[PDB]
Amino acid sequence: RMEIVKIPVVVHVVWNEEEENISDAQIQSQIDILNKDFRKLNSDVSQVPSVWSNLIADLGIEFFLATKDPNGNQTTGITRTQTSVTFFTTSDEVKFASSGGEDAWPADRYLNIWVCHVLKSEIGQDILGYAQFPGGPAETDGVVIVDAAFGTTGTALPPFDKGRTATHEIGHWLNLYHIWGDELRFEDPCSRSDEVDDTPNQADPNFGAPSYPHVSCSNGPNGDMFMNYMDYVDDKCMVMFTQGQATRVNACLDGPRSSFLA
Template identity: 50%
Template sequence: MRKIFLATAVFATLVSCMEEESTTKDEQIFSTDKRGCASHEVLQEELKANPGLAITMNEIESFTEKAIREGRLVNGKIEIPVVVNVLYKTAAQNISLAQIQSQIDVLNKDFNATNSDFNQVPDLFSGVKANVGISFVLQNVVRKSTTTTSWSTNNAMKKAPKGIAPTTPATVLNIWCCNMGGGILGYAQFPGGASSTDGVVIDDNAFGTTGTAAYPFNLGRTATHEVGHWMNLRHIWGDATCGNDQVGDTPLHNTANYGAPAYPHYSTCTGTPVEMTMNYMDYTDDRAMYMFSDGQKSRMLAVFASGGPRNSFAQP
C-alpha cells in the first residue's frame, strides 16, 4: 500500500487509452492486443499551450489531500447530468439511443457497486472495495453528421464547425462518441482544464454494451475508466514504474496490466504485493475490471466538496 502525498508531476489534463484492431472468425473483436496510453505526449502539449495549468492542478492536488485528511468530502447527493455528443460519418457510427442508455446504465452500476461482477472482488481487497455512490442521468443526445473519418486527441470533436461544443460543462458531464482512429479507445480531461474542452471522449466501438461495442471492450468499462479520470483518478500504476496514484489503499503496480490476468498477480515492486488488476483504473479488458477502492472513492468525492473543482455538480 502507498501513502497519499502531493506530487507535482500529476498535472495531466488528458488521458488517451489506445488499442490495436484485429478480428477473428468467431466473434467481432475490437482488439486482442493491449490498451496503451498517450498521456505523456498529451501532457506535454497541454503544458506548452497553457503553462499555468500546472499551477492549477497542483492547487487541486493540495485541496484534495487536505479535504481527504480533514474529512471534508461532499455530504450531499451527487447526480451527474450527462449529454452524449454523437459525431458520425457512417450510419453505424450514429449509435442508437439504446446503446447510449446501455452506457449510462453501466456507469450507474459501476459507480454504485451494483455491477454483477462486483462479487468477484477477491477477499484480499474486500475490505476496501467501494460503493462510490454517484449516479448518472442522461439529459440529452446531440447528433452531428461529419465528413471526418477519424478523430484524435486534439479536441477537434469538441469544437465548431466540425465538432460539437460542450453543453454547460460546469453542471453537465459531456461525453463525445465518435470514431477515434489510430487505435484510441478514449480520453478524459482532469479537473482544472479549460471548460470549453471539459468532458470525456469514447470511441463508438468501446461505447456501451450493444450496437457497435466490440469485444474485449464491449462492457462499457472504457467510460467508467475515463469518468474516473474526469473525477481526478490516476492510473493505478501511477504512470511510472511502481509509481504513485495518490491513493493509499491501492497496491503498488510495477506497470499497467492487460487482458484478463489470473489472480493472484504479483507486483515486482517493493514487497511484491498482489496487484489490484480488477480495478477500473488499470488497463485490463472490460471483463476483467470491476471495482474502485475506498481511497479512490475519497479522492473522487473530494472534487465535489465545497471549494472543489467540480463542486457545481454537488446537490444540497
C-alpha cells in the same frame, strides 16, 4: 448516509458513416452501466479477491441523460452531428463544431461525453477513449469514447463491450490516476504513485485478462489490483473502485466540481 450526486450527461454522437450514428439503446446501455459501477451495484464486483473485499467503494454517483438543455429547454440529452472527419485525436477536434465535432455544453452543469468512430493518440496509436482531468478549460471538459467501446449493445465489440471504458475515463474526469503511476519509459517502473494508499504499488498497466495474483514492485503475495477500473484490463476484468479512490473523488466533488452538488 451517502449524498447521491446526480450528474446530468449530454452525449455528443459525431458520425461519418450511418452505422456510427449509434442507437438510443446503445447510449442508454452505457448510462445503465455507469449507474451500476459508480454505486457498487455491478454484480461482477463478486470477482474482487476476498482479501480486498473491504476496500470496494460505492462512489455515490449516478448519471442521467439531461432533460433540460443549457437554456432550460426540453432535450433528449443526445446531440447527433454528421461530420466529414474520418478520425479524431487527443487534440480535441471532436469537441468543437468548427473542427468537425460538436461544441461542449457548460461543463459546470453537464458531463460532456463525445462518441466517435476512430480515435488516435498524437503519434497515431488507436485508443479507446480519453479524459480531461478537473481544472478547466470548460471548452474541452468531459470524456471521449470510441463507439465500439461504448455501451453493451449495438456497435460495442468484445472485449470492450461491458461499458468500462467510460467508467475508466470518468474516473479520470473525477481526478483518479492510472493505478500503475504513469512512469515514462526511462523511469523506474516502481517509482511513481497514483496518490492512493489502498491501491498496491504497481509496475506497469495490465492488459487482457490477468490471473490473480499478478505480483509486481514487491507487492506480493496479493499482487496488482488489476481488477481496478483505473488499470487497462479488459472490460469483464475491471469491477471496482477502492475507498482510497473514493476519497479523491469526494475531494473533486467538494472542490473543482462542487457545481454538481445539490
